């Protein structure tokens, strides 16, 4: 089963899908192909939880019915700079303005 | 897999499959691997990307099709984006 | 042109609403006038008696947005094989993002106030030009 994801770091967001049976490490290889950074320089998160390489996305709670095409689940991403990893930082999207009068 | 980068007015960088971005004739023209959208903020452009994923997934598929959700607060700005992008 | 044929040959049919909308079934009568039939709530079914050669289409009962039936616009009941009813699977289309946004904007703004929206004139026109069966029958011809 396919799971649909946003992989997010700072002001970067990758839209992609993967198998429920695929691994965290396999997702890192996907990110590697796109952002040109190898798996050892990557940390993936579900919320604040650091994800183990060997686990499936399914085991880490990314399921076909929660990670939907029209409402993808978010995977956090952090890079190593030199020796150490930056903290997990995800820039929020912009805020919608107030509903015009005629939409209330 | 080939990806393209779509950049919102507020600097968020959205990386989507090339095939998905070509859903939009407007984007196809801006490419024909990065496009900047000066009028589309991230809270709108993220939804646009979700729509690409949704459309590609559910076009010519018989698995029951769910509603594409759009919050009231973004609906007007999403309309304008959809109209510009012809999608 | 688009009209049911007066075949008088019974055809039993299941209307299956696999959409989240209240469905309005519409029968095209022998002069091609649309005749509305009782609505179907989301997820529900009805076994109904129709006839071979008859034409049906299906709309959101509240907004008249277009729906699909067996992946297309029109449903024509056929010969029943082995006494089995024909299945009419009614589903949402994949609307364009634009049409989907118009649907949502229409559900939030009373038609008197479309003009007050801060958008180009042609989008006021797109909102005012809401779905309707007549228009689509002219299209489909
Ligand atoms: C011989 C013939 O063609 N008779 C027509 C007829 O019996 N029709 C036209 C359509 O093929 C079909 F609608 C059928 C008919 O009217 N069947 C009764 C019917 C009643 C309720 C429903 C529905 S639709 C959603 N909910 C219900 C209960 C559907 C069909 C009519 C209208 C001239 C009497």
Residue A58 has which token pair? 């399914």
Contact C62, C131 (CB under 8 A): no
Q: Is the CB of C47 under 6 A from ligand 1?
A: no
Where are the domains positioned within chain C? Answer: 2-91, 92-141
Give the CATH number of domain B1-87; options: 3.40.140.10, 3.30.710.10, 3.90.550.10, 3.90.660.20.
3.30.710.10
Q: Report the nearest-CA residue for atom 14 of ligand 1.
A: C50
Q: Is the CB of C12 under 6 A from ligand 1?
A: no
In chain A, whose CA is at the least distance from the CA of C106?
A103
Chains that touch B (3 or more CB pairs under 8 A): A, C
Residue of A nearest to B46 (CA): A93
Q: How was this structure determined?
A: X-ray
- Secondary structure (H, E, C), chain B: CCEEEEECCCCCEEEEEHHHHCCCHHHHHHHCCEEECCCCCHHHHHHHHHHHHHHHHHCCCCCCCCCCCCCHHHHHHHHHHHHHHCC
DSSP secondary structure, chain C, as one string: ---------EEEEEEEE-SSSPEEEEEE-TTS-EEE---B-TT-EEEEEEETT-EEEEEETTT--B-EETTBS-B---PPSTTPPEEEEEE-----HHHHHHHHHHHHS-GGGGGGSSS-HHHHHHHHS---HHHHHHHT-
**Ligand 1 centroid distance, CA of C26 (Å):** 10
Considering only CB atoms, which chain C residues are within 8 Å of B67? Answer: 20, 92
Complete domains list, chain A, with CATH: 1-104 (3.10.20.90)
A55 secondary structure, DSSP code: S
B66 contacts in chain A (CB < 8 Å): 68, 70
- Report the topology of domain C92-141: Elongin C; Chain C, domain 1 (1.10.750)
Nominal resolution (angstroms): 2.3
CATH topology for C2-91 is Immunoglobulin-like (2.60.40)
Burial (0-12, 13-18, 19+ Cβ within 10 Å), C121: exposed
């Amino acid at each position: 089963m396919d799971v649909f994801l946003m992989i997010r770091r700072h002001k970067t967001t990758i839209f992609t899908d993967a198998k429920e049976s695929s691994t965290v490490f396999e997702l890192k290889r996907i990110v590697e192909g796109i952002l040109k950074r190898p798996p050892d320089e990557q940390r993936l998160y579900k919320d604040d939880q650091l994800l183990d390489d060997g686990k499936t996305l399914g085991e880490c709670g990314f399921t076909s019915q929660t990670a939907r095409p029209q409402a993808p689940a978010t995977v956090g991403l952090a890079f190593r700079a030199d020796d150490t990893f930056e903290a997990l930082c995800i820039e929020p999207f912009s805020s919608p303005p107030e509903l015009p009068d005629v939409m209330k | 897999m080939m990806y393209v980068k779509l950049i919102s007015s507020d600097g968020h960088e959205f990386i989507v499959k090339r095939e998905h971005a070509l859903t939009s004739g407007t984007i196809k023209a801006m490419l024909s691997n990065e496009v900047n959208f000066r009028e589309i903020p991230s809270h709108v452009l993220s939804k646009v990307c979700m729509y690409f994923t949704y459309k590609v997934r559910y076009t010519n598929s018989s698995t029951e099709i769910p509603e594409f959700p759009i919050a009231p607060e973004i609906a007007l700005e999403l309309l304008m984006a959809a109209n510009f992008l012809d999608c | 042109v688009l009209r049911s044929v007066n075949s008088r040959e019974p055809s039993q049919v299941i209307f299956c609403n696999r959409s989240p909308r209240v469905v309005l079934p519409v029968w095209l009568n022998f002069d091609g006038e649309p005749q509305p039939y009782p609505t179907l709530p989301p997820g529900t079914g009805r076994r109904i008696h129709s006839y071979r050669g008859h034409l049906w289409l299906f709309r959101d009962a509240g907004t008249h947005d277009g729906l699909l039936v067996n992946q297309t616009e029109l449903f024509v009941p056929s010969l029943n094989v082995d006494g089995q009813p024909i299945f009419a699977n009614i589903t949402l289309p994949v609307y364009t993002l634009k049409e989907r946004c118009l649907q949502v904007v229409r559900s939030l703004v009373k038609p008197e106030n479309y003009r007050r929206l801060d958008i180009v004139r042609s989008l006021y026109e797109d909102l005012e030009d809401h779905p309707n069966v007549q228009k689509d029958l002219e299209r489909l011809t």
